[PDB]
């Protein structure tokens, strides 16, 4: 990653064992379950494209996934490249060219460019384009994997309302809600929460139901 | 989190793979018991909210409480506006603008953002206001969650004292004393602990019922 | 903790997470056994009062003994007020307002006063006035949650010396010498005991019985 | 490897225990596996030639593949020497001899040598040279030891088709696309997506065919 | 321990969970087999007199051991104060007390004054002094619980000389060579061995009994 | 051992337990197998000989190969000492002590000599010198207990090629190469091989006989 160092100025860290075998082992246990996204975008803090590509690359494995997610980048690749055209012309001694998708994505830039947008005045933060693409085409793929619809969680009729509540914001928390939460829990629940009226907390909701 | 160097200026560093998989696992092993929020606050030291997000992201299943604890921030967030509505104005060179509830609580801030008011002179601590929103809520679950009420802290007729006193503190904790540590005490130790009188410490009331 | 840096000044670092997840473990597996407490002073070291408070709250279970550390801890503080009774008035800019009990113990008093206290010329250590309250109050419930008496330590008539020393040491360590140890050992090893005289050292006891 | 301090100057540091740990522990685990590579570049990162063979050389088993390692080394050292003669002459005080293709191999040149070249102004990164060739060879034993062909990736009568692309782009990265995932398919799924028309993403793809 | 730090000074540092754990755990694994003295020599690399007795008080058990280890620190102790009666005086302000045995030992010495002999300008090394203490105390223990005498270790008939020459020298290691190394060989190798005549390296002997 | 910090000098630092745990497990999981070597060589990096000596002692078991070791290191400090004859005479103020045999081995020199000699101008490296007749003895070591030869590593008739390419490269290794690797394989393969010619590659050979 590119981090400041004890004195102040922006340089370049090699991403360490701890960080590359944290987003390995998580995608292990996880696959593709929502947490595993912030988890993604804090090991990756301060990344380089380079990094970026190091992490989504180290994964095996969930290779329709990976495609998806190569996909979604180009995509991204290419719209930035309708916004940003590029100028023609020598690169001036204390600059740095404007960069293309591709060298957003790691794929056509170097390292010590990447450290040079990153470390510019002003910088030209590569990396968190770059991994706002990855995170956009993360999610989709989030969602394409989610199993259950919203509408399938219902409580039980001896299911704890806690229990209901936890499937339930589970699945719309993959999926990407009071109305339906209430519609979508048991009778005897369900009369509870209709005399508690509209406007009623989670907590007040969760309180009136044990 | 935003941390001095080793030279005494206050600077941004990444959360760490260790204080994310340490929150993490916690929250697997303990789930809301007591102890976890010290931990979270131990694990969130000189956090920026998107550090504080990032920890509550993190967290894979118990969506019921996380939800809940959305609606404990949001509330606060709320209030914090009616004490602090921002003047509207041109920010000068050397300043930071004002923070609305949502700006502490990282969804409407950037890190740049948080940096600033955390680094500012005085500095505005938008993480350990938010962290207070977080402790705040997170104290709620565990008294909801929390299973025994005190009333059902009995101790057995068999059961040593001290086994006993641990439950009974145990429960308390997590409802959030001396006289009804008497009271609920077995026959035999509580004709012990009247035959002590008024003032007993915990630890003369547990060495005289040994 | 409070540290120096490697720049020669005493500044503020978070508590790691190897340190909290390291106090937790050997709480989990050793309880109160006597060596606890110098584990507990060294992954304490250069601890502010926070950091104290957090480590004891960040155990769970042990509820009894941990309320029976607050009244140790609560009768130290009103020691220390009794003999520091702090004088009204106006702290002046290069200064720290003097410390009640409830400030070195974490209770009353923030970060950046402990800070303030700790890094003062001359220092004020509340942490290590607090520690010295924490690990009283640990020994006093090392003794007392002590199973077995120093004089219910026998060899047996057919126990290794070696073994039974062990025993015997353990138990006074958590009990809080010479002679005891050979009126309690087995009539073989008693006797020889005796024919080597007073003075003889635990080697040149421990050689003589085998 | 050589790394950048935090006072902004190229220095040499030990290659640490984790890093010589994990680069073992993947190949153990995962072998010749294509994101083993991408592994072995990250924890590279900022390698002397000197830490490259360390790694290569504690790798024990897989000899077949570490000697065809050596041989392709060696093919791209004899290449180098062929593009880069050195003229022979004495070395003046502020510089470096050129290297030959056994000096950026790291099996003719000293540690010293090699912190010069990578330190150098310009720098000869010898060890970014050196890896280049390693990737190439560790390329090439990943092919080889691929053992399905993309031709024999064809999609179960029942088999989910993410599955099945899964294993069609873990087989395609080791072997080293759209019309053939489209014609391996099976006679169903093959149907929708001969319906869909030219131009669809895989997500599309994916989507019809659930 | 004291450790100098990136700038060149002799500083205090707090002792490491790694380093308190990895002490700990070595006594529970291996006991007082005598490889554990140069862990422990090398684990407490810099450590102060107060670091030295952290470490021998987080073990628990082996409290035989660690007793007659306390009575050998004595012996040195006093044997210390034989050598070197303190002078009594004012100390002059840029100067250190002379330290007795007890302030070595770290049971009378703050540990601001163990920091101030050890950081001294000439140093007076109070940690290496009381570690050799400590040490020579070890080995002592060593030798009393090794279990077989050399007298006792004799090759089998059909054992490998190879697995002999280990217990040889474990043995030996422990209680504190060639010629009976030779004579406890069994008959048929003892044969080789007279043959290969006096002055044979221990690699020629082991490779005529293969 | 001997690192520069982070402001460009070198400096002694403690050996680390992350370190000296690496070297203890390798050698108990892998004993003298040839890829040990070059994971002491890394592990030991910068290394005093004192470190070296560390590392060693604290190697338990295995003391055959142990105590051949000390004999091949004292053979090359008697040659250091005959290529290296001190001369008697005052050492001057700026200047360290020429190093004998058993210096360079650690065992008559103290760390602030070995300290003196490794950042000397120019340096005397004793660390890289004893770590020569270390890797030196350990190599010898891994050949005696080498239990395979060359000559008996043939290809099973029904044996992969690639399997058997592995066990000889491994044994060759061990025992310190391309018409061998022809005459041991089998039959059909071996067939194959002389239709091949000479001056194929290991690659070419092994895509053959697949
Ligand atoms: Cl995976
Ligand atoms: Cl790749
Ligand atoms: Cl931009
Ligand atoms: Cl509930
Ligand atoms: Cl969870
Ligand atoms: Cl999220
Ligand atoms: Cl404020
Ligand atoms: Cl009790
Ligand atoms: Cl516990
Ligand atoms: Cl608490
Ligand atoms: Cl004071
Ligand atoms: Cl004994
Ligand atoms: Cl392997
Ligand atoms: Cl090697
Ligand atoms: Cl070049
Ligand atoms: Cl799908
Ligand atoms: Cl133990
Ligand atoms: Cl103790
Ligand atoms: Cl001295
Ligand atoms: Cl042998
Ligand atoms: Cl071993
Ligand atoms: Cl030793
Ligand atoms: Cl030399
Ligand atoms: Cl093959």
């Not at 975008?41 to 494995?61: E, H, Y």
């Not at 940003?84 to 001036?92: C, L, M």
């Not at 199993?147 to 039980?156: A, H, K």
Request: hydrophobic share 35%; with cysteine.
């Amino acid at each position: 990653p590119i981090v400041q160092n004890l004195q102040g100025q922006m340089v370049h860290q090699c991403i360490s064992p701890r960080t590359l075998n944290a987003w390995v082992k998580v995608v292990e246990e996880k696959a593709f379950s929502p947490e595993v996204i912030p988890m993604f975008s804090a090991l990756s803090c301060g990344a380089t494209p380079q990094d970026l590509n190091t992490m989504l690359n180290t994964v095996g494995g969930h290779q329709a996934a990976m495609h998806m997610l190569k996909e979604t980048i180009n995509e991204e690749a290419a719209e930035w490249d309708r916004l940003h055209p590029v100028h023609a012309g020598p690169i001036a001694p204390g600059q740095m060219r404007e960069p293309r998708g591709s060298d957003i994505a790691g794929t056509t830039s170097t390292l010590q460019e990447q450290i040079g947008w990153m470390t510019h005045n002003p910088p030209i933060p590569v990396g968190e384009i770059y991994k706002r693409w990855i995170i956009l085409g993360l999610n989709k793929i989030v969602r394409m994997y989610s199993p259950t619809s919203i509408l399938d969680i219902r409580q039980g009729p001896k299911e704890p309302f806690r229990d209901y509540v936890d499937r339930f914001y589970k699945t719309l928390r993959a999926e990407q809600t009071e109305t339906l939460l209430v519609q979508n829990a048991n009778p005897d629940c369900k009369t509870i929460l209709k005399a508690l009226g509209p406007g009623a907390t989670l907590e007040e909701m969760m309180t009136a139901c044990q």
